Amino acid sequence: MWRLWKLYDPRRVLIGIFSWLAVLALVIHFILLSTDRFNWVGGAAV
Amino acid sequence: MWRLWKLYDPRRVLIGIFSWLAVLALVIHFILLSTDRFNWVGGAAV
Amino acid sequence: MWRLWKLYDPRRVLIGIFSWLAVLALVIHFILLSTDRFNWVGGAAV
Amino acid sequence: MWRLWKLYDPRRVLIGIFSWLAVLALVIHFILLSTDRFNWVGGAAV
Amino acid sequence: MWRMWKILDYRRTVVLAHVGMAVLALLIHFILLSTENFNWLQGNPY
Amino acid sequence: MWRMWKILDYRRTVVLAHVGMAVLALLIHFILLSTENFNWLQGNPY
Amino acid sequence: MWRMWKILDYRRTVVLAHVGMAVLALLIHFILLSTENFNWLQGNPY
Amino acid sequence: MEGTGALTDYMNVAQMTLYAFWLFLAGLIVYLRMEDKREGYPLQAEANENCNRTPEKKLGFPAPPSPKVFKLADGRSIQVPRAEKTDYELNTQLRAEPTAPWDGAPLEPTGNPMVDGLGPAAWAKREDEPEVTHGGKQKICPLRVATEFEVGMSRDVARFWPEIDPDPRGYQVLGCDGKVAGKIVDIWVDRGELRPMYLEMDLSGVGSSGDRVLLPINFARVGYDSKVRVNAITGQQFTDVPRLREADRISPQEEDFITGYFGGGVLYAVPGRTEPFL
Amino acid sequence: NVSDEEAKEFHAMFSQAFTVYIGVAVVAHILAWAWRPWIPGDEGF
Amino acid sequence: NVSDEEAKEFHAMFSQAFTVYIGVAVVAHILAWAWRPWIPGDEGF
Amino acid sequence: AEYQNIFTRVQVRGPTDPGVELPAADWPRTKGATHSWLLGKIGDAQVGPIYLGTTGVMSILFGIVSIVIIGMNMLASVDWSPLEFIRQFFWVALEPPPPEYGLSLPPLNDGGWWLIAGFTLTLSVLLWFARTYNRARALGLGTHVAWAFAAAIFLFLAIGFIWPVLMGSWAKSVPFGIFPHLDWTTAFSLRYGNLYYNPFHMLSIVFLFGSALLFAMHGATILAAGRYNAEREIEQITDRGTAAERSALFWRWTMGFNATMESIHRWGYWFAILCVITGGIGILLTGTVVENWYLWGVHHGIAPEYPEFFTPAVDPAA
Amino acid sequence: AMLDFEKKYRVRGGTLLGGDLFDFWIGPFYVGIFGVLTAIFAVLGTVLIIYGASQDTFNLWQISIAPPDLSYGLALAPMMEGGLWQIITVCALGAFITWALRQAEISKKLGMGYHVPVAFAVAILAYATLVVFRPLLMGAWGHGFPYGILSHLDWVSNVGYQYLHFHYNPAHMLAVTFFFTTTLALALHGGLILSVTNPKKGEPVKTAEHENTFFRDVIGYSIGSLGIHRLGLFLALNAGFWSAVCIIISGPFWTRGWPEWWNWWLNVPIWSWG
Amino acid sequence: SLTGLSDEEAKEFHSIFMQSFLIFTAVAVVAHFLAWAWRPWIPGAEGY
Amino acid sequence: LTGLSDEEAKEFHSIFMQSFLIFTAVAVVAHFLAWAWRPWIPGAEGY
Numbered sequence A, B, C, D: 001m002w003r004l005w006k007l008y009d010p011r012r013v014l015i016g017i018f019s020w021l022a023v024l025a026l027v028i029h030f031i032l033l034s035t036d037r038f039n040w041v042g043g044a045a046v
Numbered sequence E, F, G: 001m002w003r004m005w006k007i008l009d010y011r012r013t014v015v016l017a018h019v020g021m022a023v024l025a026l027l028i029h030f031i032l033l034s035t036e037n038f039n040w041l042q043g044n045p046y
Numbered sequence H: 001m002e003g004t005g006a007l008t009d010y011m012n013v014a015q016m017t018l019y020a021f022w023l024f025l026a027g028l029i030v031y032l033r034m035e036d037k038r039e040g041y042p043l044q045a046e047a048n049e050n051c052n053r054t055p056e057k058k059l060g061f062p063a064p065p066s067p068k069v070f071k072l073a074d075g076r077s078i079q080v081p082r083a084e085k086t087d088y089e090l091n092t093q094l095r096a097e098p099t100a101p102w103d104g105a106p107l108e109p110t111g112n113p114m115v116d117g118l119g120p121a122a123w124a125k126r127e128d129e130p131e132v133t134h135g136g137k138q139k140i141c142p143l144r145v146a147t148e149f150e151v152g153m154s155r156d157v158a159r160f161w162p163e164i165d166p167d168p169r170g171y172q173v174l175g176c177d178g179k180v181a182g183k184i185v186d187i188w189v190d191r192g193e194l195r196p197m198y199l200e201m202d203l204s205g206v207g208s209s210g211d212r213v214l215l216p217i218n219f220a221r222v223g224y225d226s227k228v229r230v231n232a233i234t235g236q237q238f239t240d241v242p243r244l245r246e247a248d249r250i251s252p253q254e255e256d257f258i259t260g261y262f263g264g265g266v267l268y269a270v271p272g273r274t275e276p277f278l
Numbered sequence I, J: 001n002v003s004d005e006e007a008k009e010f011h012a013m014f015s016q017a018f019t020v021y022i023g024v025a026v027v028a029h030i031l032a033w034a035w036r037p038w039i040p041g042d043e044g045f
Numbered sequence K: 001a002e003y004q005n006i007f008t009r010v011q012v013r014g015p016t017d018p019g020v021e022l023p024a025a026d027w028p029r030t031k032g033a034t035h036s037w038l039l040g041k042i043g044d045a046q047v048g049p050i051y052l053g054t055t056g057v058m059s060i061l062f063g064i065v066s067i068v069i070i071g072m073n074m075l076a077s078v079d080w081s082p083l084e085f086i087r088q089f090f091w092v093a094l095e096p097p098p099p100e101y102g103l104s105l106p107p108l109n110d111g112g113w114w115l116i117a118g119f120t121l122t123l124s125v126l127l128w129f130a131r132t133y134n135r136a137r138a139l140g141l142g143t144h145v146a147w148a149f150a151a152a153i154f155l156f157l158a159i160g161f162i163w164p165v166l167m168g169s170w171a172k173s174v175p176f177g178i179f180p181h182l183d184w185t186t187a188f189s190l191r192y193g194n195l196y197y198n199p200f201h202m203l204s205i206v207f208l209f210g211s212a213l214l215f216a217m218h219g220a221t222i223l224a225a226g227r228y229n230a231e232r233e234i235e236q237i238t239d240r241g242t243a244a245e246r247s248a249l250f251w252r253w254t255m256g257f258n259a260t261m262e263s264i265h266r267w268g269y270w271f272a273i274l275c276v277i278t279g280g281i282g283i284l285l286t287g288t289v290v291e292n293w294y295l296w297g298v299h300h301g302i303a304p305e306y307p308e309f310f311t312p313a314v315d316p317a318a
Numbered sequence L: 001a002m003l004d005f006e007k008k009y010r011v012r013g014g015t016l017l018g019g020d021l022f023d024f025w026i027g028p029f030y031v032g033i034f035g036v037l038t039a040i041f042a043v044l045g046t047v048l049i050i051y052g053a054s055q056d057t058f059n060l061w062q063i064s065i066a067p068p069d070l071s072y073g074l075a076l077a078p079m080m081e082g083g084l085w086q087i088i089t090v091c092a093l094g095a096f097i098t099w100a101l102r103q104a105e106i107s108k109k110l111g112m113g114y115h116v117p118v119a120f121a122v123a124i125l126a127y128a129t130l131v132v133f134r135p136l137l138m139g140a141w142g143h144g145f146p147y148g149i150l151s152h153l154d155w156v157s158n159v160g161y162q163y164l165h166f167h168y169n170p171a172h173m174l175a176v177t178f179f180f181t182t183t184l185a186l187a188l189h190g191g192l193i194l195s196v197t198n199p200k201k202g203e204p205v206k207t208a209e210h211e212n213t214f215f216r217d218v219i220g221y222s223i224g225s226l227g228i229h230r231l232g233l234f235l236a237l238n239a240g241f242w243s244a245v246c247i248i249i250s251g252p253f254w255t256r257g258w259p260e261w262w263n264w265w266l267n268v269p270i271w272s273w274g
Numbered sequence M: 001s002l003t004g005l006s007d008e009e010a011k012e013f014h015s016i017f018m019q020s021f022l023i024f025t026a027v028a029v030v031a032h033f034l035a036w037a038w039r040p041w042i043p044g045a046e047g048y
Numbered sequence N: 001l002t003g004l005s006d007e008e009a010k011e012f013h014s015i016f017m018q019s020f021l022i023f024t025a026v027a028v029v030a031h032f033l034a035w036a037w038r039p040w041i042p043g044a045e046g047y
Ligand code: BCL
Pocket: C001, C004, D022, D026, E013, E014, E015, E016, E017, E018, E019, E020, E021, E023, E024, E027, I013, I014, I015, I017, I018, I021, L040, L044, L087, L090, L091
């Protein structure tokens, strides 16, 4: 599995994975904000 | 007037005439079909 | 004041002055038309 | 304070200062024309 | 202050003076035409 | 983990981290300002 | 704090200071003209 | 508010989608401005712009990207911005004097600005190897060697309405002052661009009839009366148009020499062009 | 570049034109004030 | 870069303008405060 | 009196360019190529040849099927009259399904023909995307044109497929007609409260107007520097001539900043595709997460307020 | 500071006015006399806009300098009743015109043709149609559009619905066709140049042969390196010009609904069929 | 120096600049005195 | 200026930290005055 890093540039994969992680975290957090049950700032009662 | 064809290329004159005649006969036939009196397939009375 | 024409091409000055006169005259006439007292063709009464 | 002209060319600062004064005078004169109290040609009362 | 022309080219300043003062003079005349008491063409009472 | 800086530029990452954290700090403050329970400027009841 | 000019170009800083404080001072004067207690031209009660 | 899309009491999905696009648009704007800084950068701050009276380099904002390698068809990996062009520009001694010592003062040429490459007469430092097509032919060649091209896109238009499909071979050339400079002997065509680029003329009117000079087509106004009118330069000035190193080829450098010389006529061909209308 | 002599000649033509323009303009404002003064009073005009 | 003497001449010109500008600004704000204080109380102005 | 680089005065015709050689698996190009004097004035005179491969043929077949379905339904709506077809040419359309069908498959004459026309039209444009992609790769070019086309596809799919699917009815989609799809455009704005207040419609217009602004700026600059062979832009990117410097200096002196011969085409490329991408996002937002765009603008404090000029109307049914 | 090739181009001459007096650069900007004027006009108009904003609201989108009432006709209005708009209009017009004249000074200095100032004159023509020509024909400066980011969108909405379906405006359908086509052409032009100079990694920079071959492979025609910039300028300038035509005929030359305009097409004797 | 002005030229331009500035300012001061006598622009606590 | 040495970097750093301390100190006082005018952290009831 270590040969993955002789195929792709380690920096490029680091930049792409972090960008995907940042986008996904933003998308999920706002997905929870748009629902009633998981809006922590909204303080909705379950 | 035979000299008219030493000036104007016969093919372009004949193509021009044919294009005019085709458009004109189509336009006259269409105009007749648009009228109530001369629509021969609409079958109206005078 | 004749020294003025040592400084500018007389042709460019005649173009410039007659351009001001043409635009200024049209604007003054148009302003007079736009009034209800100096509009001569409208037959304004006083 | 004379050394300011060892830094800025007199032609450019004067062009910029005069452009600033022209903008400033028009803005202040026009702002006064906007107000009811200082519109001198409008001539309101106090 | 004749030294003002050793900084500003006199030929170009004269031209700039005329065009600029033309704009200002038209602006002021147009402003008076907008007012009620100084529109000389409309002639409202004073 | 110091070897992280043999992959991504430290000069580039530091600057993009300040910009990135600028957006994130601004975003979270503005998200809280858009609530009612955490808008400290409005000071709604909690 | 004359060592500041060993870092920042004194000319460009001075120009930047005048343009920036120009816009800032216009901004603040306009803010006061937007209010009701500090618009000195309107002269509302305080 | 309430409904689908609400994220808080004020924030909604469309609004946060908008700010998400703001962050992207900024990152794209910054990226685009960096791609803007691969030619002519870093900026050369001259001594007379800085209070310390020393030349410097300004990166600007955003700072320029790292150098970019264009691999070329002939097997030559060139880097951008190119080192030889930057080195030529920074070392060339301009034959001009600033009209004032302060920064932003225009240069006033000392000698002849047209042959010295000042202002509109200026040329870039380019390659001296003549360009080739993808197949290896000479890219810009005259019609005497590029014999597969014949003048005139339409044979019938060229034969019956030659005014709109002209053949400028044998045309007289006139300068901006109406004087006859010579006769067009040949046309140069780009094998890739499939267009005329230069009108080779002799100097039979103002010099040796055996001399050959290239007139760029965009400076030539091919008339309807067998005369080509060049507004760029005076007829007498056709003699100083730079000559080709080889009579049958032109390098990209000589293209910048020749088009540069004619472009310089726009200001320097006759007195008064530099001078304003008023 | 301009010498003191050619500068003074430029100022000479400036002064003749400035005084004629200013002089006729002053008359224009005196006639304008004789017609309708433009400084309103406490009650206006 | 600039020498110490050039940089000190820069800062002498700066300090002169800074003091005049800030002095006028302090006076102007003291006048504006005597006119209409701009910090409201709990009940307004 | 100077030559304005608007029409090519002198043209030179040689043999037809058969194109750069393709890899030894591509279909042969067509053999038909002729030169046009009229087109040679504006630019390249050669018309044809054209490549047609698997993706090209299947895109044409899917597209022809779509055009036949739309055209025959258009013609059928006027009782098959070619005269009435010309009279009503801008008004006829293949109508989308009525709202009652939702996302199901409706009968042919009740939006079924529309759904088939939309499906084959979608397939033809997607295959055409693969065609633009492969023609670039076959020449060893970047796939920039295809992805720019993909950006235009996404707005086309957002308008016609994704947004109607997100809304749960094929009725929300746009009919295949000239004036009818203009009726759809206006009604869309009426229904969801003035699309002007949609911010991604604002951005879409920013990049659309900026695209016309950019092409006007760039096209005028390349023609203006045509005296220095600016239009040979590939040579200027790899070998910066004086035309590239005068183009950059012209805009640096004008607005304080410039581009390069290469970066200008990045600006124009991104402006073209951002126009169509913010367009798609704006369409996907309305109806789904924004009901009324003016009310959205009021909420976010962007609606101007207007002083009294008339007596406000009151809803009698309030 | 200057580009590393910029110095040799900064010469004297090319002005239309001002001569040597304003013929200099401030930083990257060439100044000229029309740069000083465009600066005075632009600052005057912008500061006047902010003053108008201070009188209603500072919210950036809700700022609005509106034209006067139609009842004012062509008269200049009180400052707070559209006179502020009128001054901003003459300031913006002067700012635009001196900007184009300044670009003309820059054109001559670099030996370029006047394509840029003229192409900008079309944009100025469209604004002049919006605030001068059309308000003139209709008979009131109040027909121009307000100066506000969101208030001029309501003007476009209401002026469009003054003709009940503005999509049927024949000149507007032409201008929209030119706008859509020019961004299509811009996508193709920008993309094709990037595709050649930035091929797949490991490939040489291609030629103008590949550019012509690409579009002949795709659509069967290629307009060429020179044709794409003539057509690109043509499509964008027709976009501006037909914008001017579509709005100048909306009200001065057509007062009914635009769909009704197509009544002549429906009545052509060739295809009436009744 | 930058701008190529000798120290004496800088000092001479300074005196004329400061003179032109005081004359321009003095006229403004007078104009403001006339403007204030016409209508004061600092409202009292009760307005105008 | 771009290639500062160690002694020049240490000298610039101390002046930067002194400038930042003065800037922060003046701001801290400004906040202590702003709190005296109107506090900005509400209680559970609000303001
Ligand atoms: C036969 C001789 C020539 C002639 C020879 C000369 C000579 C020689 C000179 C003049 C000069 C002047 N001439 Mg002359 N002149 C002639 C006859 C005239 C007539 C006439 C109707 O007969 C007029 C009205 C003028 C007018 C003028 C003045 C512009 C100027 C004198 C005042 C001055 O010093 O301005 C100076 C005032 C300024 C420069 C102020 C600048 C104003 C700026 C530009 C304001 C810009 C802001 C803008 C208005 C903002 C617009 C916003 C709006 C809302 C649109 N001339 C004839 C045609 N004239 C003198 C001159 O121009 O010197 C410079 C001068 O030396």
